[PDB]
Design a protein around this ligand. Sequence first.
Ligand SMILES: Nc1nc2c(ncn2[C@@H]2O[C@H](COP(=O)(O)OP(=O)(O)OP(=O)(O)O)[C@@H](O)[C@H]2O)c(=O)[nH]1
Ligand SMILES: Nc1ncnc2c1ncn2[C@@H]1O[C@H](COP(=O)(O)OP(=O)(O)CP(=O)(O)O)[C@@H](O)[C@H]1O
Ligand SMILES: Nc1nc2c(ncn2[C@@H]2O[C@H](COP(=O)(O)OP(=O)(O)O)[C@@H](O)[C@H]2O)c(=O)[nH]1
Ligand SMILES: COc1ccc(N(C)c2nc(Cl)nc3sccc23)cc1
Ligand SMILES: [Ca+2]
Ligand SMILES: [Mg+2]
Ligand SMILES: [Mg+2]
Lengths: 53, 437, 268, 427
Amino acid sequence: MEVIELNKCTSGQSFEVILKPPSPSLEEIQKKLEAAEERRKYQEAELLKHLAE
Amino acid sequence: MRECISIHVGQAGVQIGNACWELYCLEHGIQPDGQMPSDKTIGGGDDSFNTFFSETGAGKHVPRAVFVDLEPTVIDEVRTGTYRQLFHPEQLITGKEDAANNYARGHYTIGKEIIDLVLDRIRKLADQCTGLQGFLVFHSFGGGTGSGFTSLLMERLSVDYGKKSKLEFSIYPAPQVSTAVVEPYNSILTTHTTLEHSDCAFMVDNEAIYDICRRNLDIERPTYTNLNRLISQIVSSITASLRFDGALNVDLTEFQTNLVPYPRIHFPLATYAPVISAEKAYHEQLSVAEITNACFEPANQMVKCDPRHGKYMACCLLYRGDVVPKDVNAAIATIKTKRSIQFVDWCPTGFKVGINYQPPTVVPGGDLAKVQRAVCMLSNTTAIAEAWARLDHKFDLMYAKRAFVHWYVGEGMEEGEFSEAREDMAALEKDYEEVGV
Amino acid sequence: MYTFVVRDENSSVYAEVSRLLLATGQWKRLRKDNPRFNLMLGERNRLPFGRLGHEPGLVQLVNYYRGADKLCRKASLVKLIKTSPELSECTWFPESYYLEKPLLLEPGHRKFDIRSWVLVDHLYNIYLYREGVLRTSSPYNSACHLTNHCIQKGYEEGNEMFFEEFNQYLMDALNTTLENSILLQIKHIIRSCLMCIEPAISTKHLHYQSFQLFGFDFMVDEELKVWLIEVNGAPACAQKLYAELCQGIVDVAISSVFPTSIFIKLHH
Amino acid sequence: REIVHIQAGQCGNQIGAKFWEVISDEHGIDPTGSYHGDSDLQLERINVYYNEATGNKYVPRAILVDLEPGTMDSVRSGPFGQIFRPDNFVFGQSGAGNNWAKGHYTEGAELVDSVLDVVRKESESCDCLQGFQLTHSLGGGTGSGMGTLLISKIREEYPDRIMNTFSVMPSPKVSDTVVEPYNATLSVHQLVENTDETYCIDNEALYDICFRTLKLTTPTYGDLNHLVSATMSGVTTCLRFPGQLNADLRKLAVNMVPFPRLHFFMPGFAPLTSRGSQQYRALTVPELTQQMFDSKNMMAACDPRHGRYLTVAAIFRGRMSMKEVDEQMLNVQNKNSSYFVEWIPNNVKTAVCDIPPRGLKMSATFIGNSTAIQELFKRISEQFTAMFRRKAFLHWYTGEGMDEMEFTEAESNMNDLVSEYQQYQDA
Ligand SMILES: Nc1nc2c(ncn2[C@@H]2O[C@H](COP(=O)(O)OP(=O)(O)OP(=O)(O)O)[C@@H](O)[C@H]2O)c(=O)[nH]1
Ligand SMILES: Nc1ncnc2c1ncn2[C@@H]1O[C@H](COP(=O)(O)OP(=O)(O)CP(=O)(O)O)[C@@H](O)[C@H]1O
Ligand SMILES: Nc1nc2c(ncn2[C@@H]2O[C@H](COP(=O)(O)OP(=O)(O)O)[C@@H](O)[C@H]2O)c(=O)[nH]1
Ligand SMILES: COc1ccc(N(C)c2nc(Cl)nc3sccc23)cc1
Ligand SMILES: [Ca+2]
Ligand SMILES: [Mg+2]
Ligand SMILES: [Mg+2]
């Protein structure tokens, strides 16, 4: 069981122990954020037009 | 020295952010006014704690933090709370209409109206950084803001800060304390959209934090305050290497290096010990061996799952207090004989160890006892995929009937973003399975 | 009232266990997919252990030990025996990667294997059911070799000798008992196998709990010396013993969690 | 996050007035708008329902509407009648004669714009309007016909705010006229399309509770409205008070309504009490839980065992163990899991508030989205066709310009609502 990489300082120490070794763009974002706002605006336009009927 | 900016999104993220910053001030000797008697370099310095605090000419230490919510209720408590003077008013950003537990409302309708403002307030902190390391993002999976606005913000951060590391502290949803029936929808949506923009993510399951508070703190019904103090001790364990002197996990890139060998499997499991009630008058202090052994008990994990039935790709031990390397290696040797600790074949079987001699700080009057030594284990085990299995199932039950989808479609989202997000999660669970059998 | 769900409809053993649970008037069967169960008699493959024990207000129990497949699949068992130091590379497992002088019942010159049913409860008690069964073969010849019930397809009814007759035979023919000549070895083998994997599969500090029924298949040789052939993780019982064993599974494994003895506790 | 309250017609204004009496007392506002309260939980979210005025006077954000002056006079004469802003009284003179067509098409149209002017003035001074809350009956003419006309126009002008209603369903046991099934069916057709949430307050259930449980031999509208105000106070608790779940009308809609049209709720209350007689033994949390889920405590006269709960929202008021409340709520679901749809995980959510209602040390209010509500709509459908098949009493409606065809659409839409509720009872 091998200990390695030991670094000590006045605050503590760190080290390693090996038991065994191995064996979108800003414009694309703007597009989809605005595609959604159009589907919202469209659906609201169906609401108001139906309420207009 | 390289700076780190903390970003707290939604109710969970803000309230957890307050717990952490309160604890950070106590550990570093910074008072609620921002004064730090121990900083002899007035007005500046490239000390380790400057990774998280900037200094004013007047000697004030100000968190490198922005708090963001789509409603003012929660951040207003920061504006009037004991640490109000700590934060510059520009760091506390508030909307008027929250996301209504709706990912699509946070990401698309309300999110798109405030994203530009948030990124400029963030740019203001980046501009006071001599070399910006990256971001720590705190948020819930379950809230409409925590999930929907966070993923919108993570996309923009990748665009505006391409070379910079992004880490996550994510509150996984639990029914004992949840606020909404649709938290499974928001979790999958925000995970899918964020996965590529996050280098490392520490999940905390509210179910785990809750039971630890009941079992070990004798809190009959834990509140958000109980959970956040325990959660902030763990976050402080994870971030101590960035704020203190040492050689392990000194920058955000080391977290990926040491814990995430494969990019999509980037959710290390955190296990924390010892958690002792402040009410216990007589407590027998736990040795290095006892607290280290406790790191392999599922009842101390931030997510309940069984690492015996998974495989390890990485494992770090973060000790604080009276701990020396010899006791650790002694502890490991005996734990290795007695436990099912299987590493994937293409990774060494080993533990990277970090020891900070300052024993954990506890909030005066909190529920946590002061202890002589404590440890936080970060292991990347495939066992954490059990949490994805749980969540994806709950998602599947509702989505099969399309229950509640109209609230998302009504905000501008498309039904196919649900199945697309679900498919990504199917690929993720499959990844963990290939890496773990 | 406790609640349970049934997810393997081909288990004779737990079909009888469901029948027994309902008839106490204290258990109601839910639907397969309802998650608000106390008890899961689960499916035999891909059982979803990762979704157990996250139901607040419910103590959950399941009739399988996650990880016990290592014992219960031909190639895993040999891997486990050769590699685990607790079972050295081991006097009672045939070399693996035929037993050429088996014990042969007379009359018939026949060949046999012994099945033992073992029940491991959520506390990891190991309970050996006292009723065993020998599977006979209606005459062994080098150069009726596979004692499987179906393969043999009638001495003793259905080609099964229970322990009282087999013990009577050992006294008459060999001047010994079933206890001294074979069962010490069997209890030893069972105890070693289950103590070996206990750290891998135990549910003592877990958020859900497990019990499970095993079928150990043994082969006695001409020196009255026992060998482990196979461990079966989803076994069936013999019709004569169904009632008792299934009633035992309820008393020891189910009522113990949700509230003289036919089992021998193998102390460890 | 301001709520705008509208009360229409006789029933609407009477239960509307009671609601404002009861919650004002809970928030420590007296009839003159002055706060004389003990706790500061009482004012934290007080702006949700009240507007601020000079002298720290709290004025309800309420608009009183009726085509008939008489009931609004009585409100002005009532206990808290002077707390309402006088410009928010909007009334005509001809009444609606229990006629949905007069309320929706002829008399109500004359007055609806004046009401919308008052609604607009209140909205234009809100930081962030959540939406609206309407109290009305479905069996008369004004609340039913003019109420639904108002909903339709409020939606056109505020299409992104939440519309919530307390709708009193008619019953032959508490019946003004024979045409109530006609008025109710035409209204349900409007509510299905244009509200986000409506609490089905069934006069049959309120009658049966007064008669069978409260032992009142001859129940009055006063005895009915005591139940209605206890229910109305309970179900809004999480909108008016600060807690772990700070709720608003949209979060209620999102978590209670899996499919847009299935937004009709069964309210429940415990303990059930009659006016004037107080009993002195508080209930135990296990008693609250069992009574609140009991069919005898439902205000919608549907057997819940005849359907499934899609979602449930519960609120416990008073000083009690949240651990015991959680265990008891978990107990009822685990012991009765077959009555909760399995395809909506964790569809029961519980809140707790420390302030109890007046006269009770402990109460539990129940809000169920159950497929058993279809029983309510079938009952009304049967009564409608019994008359409609002979076109009986239609001249009252054709006289105002309505066509039979309109009745056919409304009945057929209500039968569709019943089918849709039946769809999910089996899944
Ligand atoms: N651990 C912990 N979890 C929290 C806390 N606050 C909220 N949560 C979790 O967050 C989930 C809901 O997300 P929130 O963050 O509260 O919602 P939000 O981010 O404000 O987004 P909105 O929907 O707009 O309110 C709940 O299921 C809670 O479990 C907290 O203070 N600590
Ligand atoms: N090494 C050995 N020496 C002698 N006989 C052996 C043997 N290994 C197996 N046998 C015999 O041959 C049979 C081969 O069947 P096998 O062991 O594959 O069946 P099984 O135990 O999987 C059936 P079940 O699951 O129903 O118990 C055994 O049941 C046993 O009777
Ligand atoms: N619970 C209750 N129901 C009422 C009350 N007043 C009227 N109703 C019901 O409302 C119906 C009459 O409609 P109403 O509101 O009086 O006509 P409007 O004046 O045009 O709104 C009847 O079927 C009653 O059952 C009341 O005070 N309480
Ligand atoms: C199905 O899960 C649910 C149901 C309802 C809610 N919310 C938003 C509530 N809102 C209001 Cl106003 N009151 C109450 S009382 C208990 C919940 C509750 C949350 C989750
Ligand atoms: Ca300095
Ligand atoms: Mg919030
Ligand atoms: Mg009337």
